[PDB]
Amino acid sequence: SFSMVTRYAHSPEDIQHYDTSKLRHEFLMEKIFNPGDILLTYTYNDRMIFGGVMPTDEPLEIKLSTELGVDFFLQRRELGIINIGGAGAITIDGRKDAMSNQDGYYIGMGTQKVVFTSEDRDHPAKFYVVSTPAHKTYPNKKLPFATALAKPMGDQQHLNKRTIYKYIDASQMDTCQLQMGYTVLEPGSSWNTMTHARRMETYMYFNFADPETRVFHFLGKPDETRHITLFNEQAVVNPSWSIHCGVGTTNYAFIWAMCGENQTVAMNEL
Amino acid sequence: SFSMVTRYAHSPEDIQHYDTSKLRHEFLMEKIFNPGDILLTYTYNDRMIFGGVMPTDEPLEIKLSTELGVDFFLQRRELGIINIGGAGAITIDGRKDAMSNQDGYYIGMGTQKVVFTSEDRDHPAKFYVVSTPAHKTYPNKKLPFATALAKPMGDQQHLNKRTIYKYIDASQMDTCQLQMGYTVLEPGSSWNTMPAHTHARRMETYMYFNFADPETRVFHFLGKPDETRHITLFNEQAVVNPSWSIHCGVGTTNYAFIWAMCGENQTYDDMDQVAMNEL
Amino acid sequence: SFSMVTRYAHSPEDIQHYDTSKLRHEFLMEKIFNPGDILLTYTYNDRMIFGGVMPTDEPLEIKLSTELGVDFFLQRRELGIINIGGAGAITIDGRKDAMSNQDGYYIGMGTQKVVFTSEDRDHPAKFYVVSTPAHKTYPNKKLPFATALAKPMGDQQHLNKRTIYKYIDASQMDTCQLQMGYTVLEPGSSWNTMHARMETYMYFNFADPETRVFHFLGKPDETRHITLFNEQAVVNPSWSIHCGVGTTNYAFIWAMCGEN
Amino acid sequence: SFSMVTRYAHSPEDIQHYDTSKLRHEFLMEKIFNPGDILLTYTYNDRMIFGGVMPTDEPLEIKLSTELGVDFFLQRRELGIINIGGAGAITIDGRKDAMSNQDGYYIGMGTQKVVFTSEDRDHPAKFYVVSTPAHKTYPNKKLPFATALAKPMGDQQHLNKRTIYKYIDASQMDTCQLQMGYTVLEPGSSWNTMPAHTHARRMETYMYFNFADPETRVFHFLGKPDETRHITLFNEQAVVNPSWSIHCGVGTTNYAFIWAMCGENQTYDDMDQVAMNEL
Amino acid sequence: SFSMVTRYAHSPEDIQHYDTSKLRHEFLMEKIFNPGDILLTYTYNDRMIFGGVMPTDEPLEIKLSTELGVDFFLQRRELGIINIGGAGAITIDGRKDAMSNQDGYYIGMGTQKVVFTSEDRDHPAKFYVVSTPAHKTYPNKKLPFATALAKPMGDQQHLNKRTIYKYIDASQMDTCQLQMGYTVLEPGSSWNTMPAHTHARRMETYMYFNFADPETRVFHFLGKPDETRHITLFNEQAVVNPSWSIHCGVGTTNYAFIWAMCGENQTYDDMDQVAMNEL
Amino acid sequence: SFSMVTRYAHSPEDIQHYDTSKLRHEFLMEKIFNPGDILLTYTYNDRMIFGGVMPTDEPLEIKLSTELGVDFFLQRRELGIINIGGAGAITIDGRKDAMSNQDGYYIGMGTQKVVFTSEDRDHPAKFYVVSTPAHKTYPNKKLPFATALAKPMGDQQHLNKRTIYKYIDASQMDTCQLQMGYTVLEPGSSWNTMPAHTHARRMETYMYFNFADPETRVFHFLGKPDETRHITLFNEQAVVNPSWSIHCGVGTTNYAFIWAMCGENQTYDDMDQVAMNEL
Ligand SMILES: [Zn+2]
Ligand SMILES: [Zn+2]
Numbered sequence A: 001s002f003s004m005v006t007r008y009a010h011s012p013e014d015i016q017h018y019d020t021s022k023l024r025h026e027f028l029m030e031k032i033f034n035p036g037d038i039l040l041t042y043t044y045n046d047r048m049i050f051g052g053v054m055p056t057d058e059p060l061e062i063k064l065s066t067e068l069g070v071d072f073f074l075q076r077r078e079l080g081i082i083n084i085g086g087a088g089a090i091t092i093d094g095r096k097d098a099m100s101n102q103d104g105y106y107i108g109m110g111t112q113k114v115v116f117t118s119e120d121r122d123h124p125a126k127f128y129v130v131s132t133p134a135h136k137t138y139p140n141k142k143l144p145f146a147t148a149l150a151k152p153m154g155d156q157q158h159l160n161k162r163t164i165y166k167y168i169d170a171s172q173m174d175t176c177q178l179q180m181g182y183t184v185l186e187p188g189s190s191w192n193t194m195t196h197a198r199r200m201e202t203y204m205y206f207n208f209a210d211p212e213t214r215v216f217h218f219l220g221k222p223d224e225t226r227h228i229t230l231f232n233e234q235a236v237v238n239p240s241w242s243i244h245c246g247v248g249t250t251n252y253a254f255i256w257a258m259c260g261e262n263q264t265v266a267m268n269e270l
Numbered sequence B, D, E, F: 001s002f003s004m005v006t007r008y009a010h011s012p013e014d015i016q017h018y019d020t021s022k023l024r025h026e027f028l029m030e031k032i033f034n035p036g037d038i039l040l041t042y043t044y045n046d047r048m049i050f051g052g053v054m055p056t057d058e059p060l061e062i063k064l065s066t067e068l069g070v071d072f073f074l075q076r077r078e079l080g081i082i083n084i085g086g087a088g089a090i091t092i093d094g095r096k097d098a099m100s101n102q103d104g105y106y107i108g109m110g111t112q113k114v115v116f117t118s119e120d121r122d123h124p125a126k127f128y129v130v131s132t133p134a135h136k137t138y139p140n141k142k143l144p145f146a147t148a149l150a151k152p153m154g155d156q157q158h159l160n161k162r163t164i165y166k167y168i169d170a171s172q173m174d175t176c177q178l179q180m181g182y183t184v185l186e187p188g189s190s191w192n193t194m195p196a197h198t199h200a201r202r203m204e205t206y207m208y209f210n211f212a213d214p215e216t217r218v219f220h221f222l223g224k225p226d227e228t229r230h231i232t233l234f235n236e237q238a239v240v241n242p243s244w245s246i247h248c249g250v251g252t253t254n255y256a257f258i259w260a261m262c263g264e265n266q267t268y269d270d271m272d273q274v275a276m277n278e279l
Numbered sequence C: 001s002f003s004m005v006t007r008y009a010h011s012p013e014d015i016q017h018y019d020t021s022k023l024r025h026e027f028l029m030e031k032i033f034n035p036g037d038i039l040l041t042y043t044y045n046d047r048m049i050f051g052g053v054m055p056t057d058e059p060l061e062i063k064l065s066t067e068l069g070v071d072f073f074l075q076r077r078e079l080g081i082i083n084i085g086g087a088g089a090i091t092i093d094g095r096k097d098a099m100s101n102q103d104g105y106y107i108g109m110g111t112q113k114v115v116f117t118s119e120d121r122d123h124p125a126k127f128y129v130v131s132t133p134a135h136k137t138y139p140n141k142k143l144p145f146a147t148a149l150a151k152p153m154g155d156q157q158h159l160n161k162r163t164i165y166k167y168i169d170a171s172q173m174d175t176c177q178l179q180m181g182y183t184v185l186e187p188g189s190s191w192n193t194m195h196a197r198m199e200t201y202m203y204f205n206f207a208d209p210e211t212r213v214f215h216f217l218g219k220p221d222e223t224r225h226i227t228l229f230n231e232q233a234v235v236n237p238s239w240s241i242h243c244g245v246g247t248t249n250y251a252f253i254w255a256m257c258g259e260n
């Protein structure tokens, strides 16, 4: 089936008395990949659309045209995709392109038809998609995981030994506002980003080491923080006014997506 | 003489128990033009910046560079100007251009220096500015009030007899996401946008001015269609209408207002019309 | 076909956090005229009773006795009626009196039987009634629309060109507490009333079927609003302003009481 | 040295979450008698005025004229007076009448000048006044304490052995809407309105005084029968009980209180008794 | 049936805006004696367990072993019993002891099996039990009502004429932290603990019973001395009083109540007594 | 410079709408060791007293007698001490005993005088004290760090590699209701109590210190298992965990913490393990 939900924006003052269940409602997407479904969220935090498409038997396309006041999905929007699942393919205005595990794609404004397929149905592909408003059309570009540039950072003393792969980066590509990346924490480290008011971020956590892994994501004003506890393959959206960092009981990975009006804190928490 | 304040976005459920003072603070810009000053707002409703610059003696320029993460103000933004005051002038990267009353200007992305001047100091120009994030450079275009096309609408039976001027309209011009217009109500009429609407892919800012006599007040309605609130406006004040909110107002006398809109599309037939069954 | 509900009084700080649904409940009488029914409100704002009686086949009378601790309705109360519907009649302790459209009546304390009938059932009379505590008997009096003094007021620039008709006015009549009038807004005007020692407004005669009236209440610096359909009523406590604006013109009946 | 404060009416739902401090503010008059002052409350509970006048050197009169939309205080109001203090005298449009301790007076509508004096300055008179809106003039009547009819009731088992004095009673005199009485609790018993009640067409105001010893306290109960609250009282304080509320009290020792009532009917049977089933 | 509910502790500031229904839930045990049942509360106010045991046909035992992290109920706890019902008996490690009406028993730490029985089924025994954490074992002691020491106090002037019985009193017996007593009010008096107090290193639980006639009600007051609340009680109900709280009551008629106390000391001198100036 | 503050208990429902600032106030002791000072808190969770003693020039004694209703501090209480600072000494009923870093002491009920000294003033000793109510006197015992039994646990995959030292342990010594231990996390590990739990018959207090670098912070979690909150801690701060609450923490680097436990059972077996499904 197809489903897209709408979550509004808030101020720090609004959430200050939200309980645990409300925080989950306004800031957490509890399900992203369901076999045969397209699950999306529309957040008024800069009007990002994010979610997953996991085709099994029929090929799937994001069919929203009139819900956005445009003739087709990408008439005034750009799209970035990373596949965290099995062998699949996306075919763009008729031209098919095979996407391996952890391969990525950027599709620019004005692309008329984008269709997601899975090769193996019992081990389907999991396309994590992020779309943002766009005013200029830029060229489409496949980002093989082989050629994604790896940057090791962190250390063991600070429990943040990870590897950052830059996928959709302004120093390597032209896009309108959208930036995506992918961070793998090495075993024995579980800590990420440890406020920009001119942009915002959304994190999608996955690849939990063992099934009993949980992740604590922190959000809020630096001196008034809250947390949201995450299972595997869930995503949390961070407003501009909020810090964004997390801890896990073990290591994990996550895809981050960023937008705002440009493309470029301290230690006093609570 | 330069000030920019920040207002956040909200959900309908958030404002549901705001008292009057909270409502005014979160949605109303109480002062826009002060002689010699630049007064602006940053709303996280689609990151619009709006406000006024009113040059008297020295020219003024909106010098936001690093507060926005860019090298100059308009490095990733477009700009629209309407002059509601006296004879003034704008100089754009060295090129001077005279702006009489009700003249308007569109400035495209990448324009590096925009400097506002007034010709007569005792009757200064009142530049209402509206800026929105932009990704494509479109050409600058002065919108003379003479050549603004007038469309009369409304009637006396419904108290909405007015004349609409199109200033920055998608059917006349290329812009990234920004639209502006100017609506003047005739005497005896005081109702705007009355069959009311909500569009989910755009948002609007109303700036009320040209009040008839000094005791005029305007009641601006906002909120979900079945849970509406109002804010009482004096002359030269502005209201931010989030997408989930209706936007309409009535005055004790006639008035005028400039509306500025932005969002992810610019098509006008993307609205949900609100039937007259509301609250 | 008889109903009387009870609404309490509030302070300004009490209503400050009412949502619209609560504001509607506490301050708005959503239904007044239903054919064959008597619909009333009892407000503890000076203990006014207001409502409607719309007789169709059988005659109607407001038979409150022990609910007010008295032997008959008007034992300690005065009553005012305006008929906004069809040809009707009032029978007062046996004497029948014909009431045309927009005719009015004052009924004083001690009157034991007041009985409402309509001539044509298909076009029934719409009796808007208002009762207030009373201590002195004043004579009953028919108020024909012909004899009500009209005062034109307002202008077009301020959108409040109207005509005020006085029916129960202290300068023309004796009553204990009660004052009633009738205001008609001219086409093209919609603003009305643009006091601490209370008023109740009943709006009707909406020009077109999509007409609405926004009624404002609250302390002058902290105002709220209530949206009204045709033939609905709002009660204004002494501490509140009284204002309304409509998408078109309309008419409304006002009833007032207090200490002067 | 004159004061009148204004208290509004509430519903049961409104007060349900009042703390102790708000409950006192909304329902309690903490000071009533001050030498040389007139202290009043105006409650929108049937628009009753109650308070005290205690003259020492200069004689006092309640000069509310335009504050009530009338030419003089009693142009549309009734007045009931009881003196709980020293020997004094009140003069009515020129006629002087000496008022001893526990004497009472009823003054009808239209009386233009009422002046309260104290005879001994060091032991002054305490005039507790209660005024209620009035439409008919009824004759003035001195109610000497000698000639007031007493009725003893209650028993020792139920701690409510008392004696009731009727002062302004519909069965002994005509008044517009006002009724007053006076209850003295016997030693060893302290409980008033013991199976309590709610009349929806009348409201009552109780003023407690004559505490046995200086540390006596009275706990006055008010509220809906299933949601009750209480207010802790010192000597010579007053509490206002809405129509929707029960009204009863118990004290640590004996005391006395005068009660004043009004509404739309002067009938004593209209009340709803409450079986002892109440949270 | 066996039933034990758990109530947490609160601060003064927490209850300040409780409505009536909440106050009942957090502080009142509405049912204690039901034939054939064991009804208990565990309050995080010093971890007191109190309730009733009412055997009718089969004998009853409080078999909390692993629910408390111990091998048997009294492994780290002491127990106090007063019988307010018919002739019964309790069996202690096989040893039976007859308990008449109003007899009391103390059972010390380490006692492994305590079994409650009733002689007459149609008139069953009502064992009010209070168990408290204990670290030192003291000998078990039957406290007969005949041999209970009586102390009359109070008078009729203050409506508190009563007689106090000592049951578990640190001056006649050794216990770990538990003290129980029994107070009966005379006819014509209905006030207990009236010059009231707050001891900060101890807390009390009051259980009201023996109401005079079936329409008796008792108003128990609790809270910070300046922010007082009340709870209306029926017969055979109990209230839990936190350390920060005053505790007292008034009844429409006379009554009786058992009080149980624990804390970190057993000195009756440690109390911050409360003068009548402060609610 | 003696200071003891008093904190009350709360129910899970009470804290649910606390902001961060209330949570810090209700649950966190932000300063414990100040040179020359005794800083303690009194919590109504089982009436634990904990805090710090840091003598510089003068020896220090906890001089609480009438504040607790007893003749000397430990008249009805036991005491646990761990030294986290420089070389010091404590003298117990006259007998002096030198206490080096990480040494510990148990002082039982009835000990009359306990006097703290530090040897080097510029590097004073840090006596972290925890006191608990007691009913039986047990012998005093020095718990040297040399003879403290070390138990290594955890792994690197789960980031909880630590060493648990048992100081006051039911399997090595008799105490009334009190356990203290010590946990040192190795470099690269930060999670403590990650197989998490709640015990309903006792409660724990965590005091975190020895942060690796000055920018270390520890996030301590508390609340019902499905409704968790967190508190951010600096070095040498303490958090109080009610029985209904989970207690576990994670840091940006490694650290150490002392835990103290008390309740009605000393048994480790009695915990409800909370699985990894929690919010
Ligand atoms: Zn960031
Ligand atoms: Zn619009």
Ligand SMILES: [Zn+2]
Binding pocket: C195, C199, C242
């Ligand atoms: Zn008015």
Ligand SMILES: [Zn+2]
Binding pocket: D197, D199, D204, D247, D271
């Ligand atoms: Zn009464």
Ligand SMILES: [Zn+2]
Binding pocket: E197, E199, E204, E247
């Ligand atoms: Zn006590």
Ligand SMILES: [Zn+2]
Binding pocket: F197, F199, F204, F247
């Ligand atoms: Zn634990």
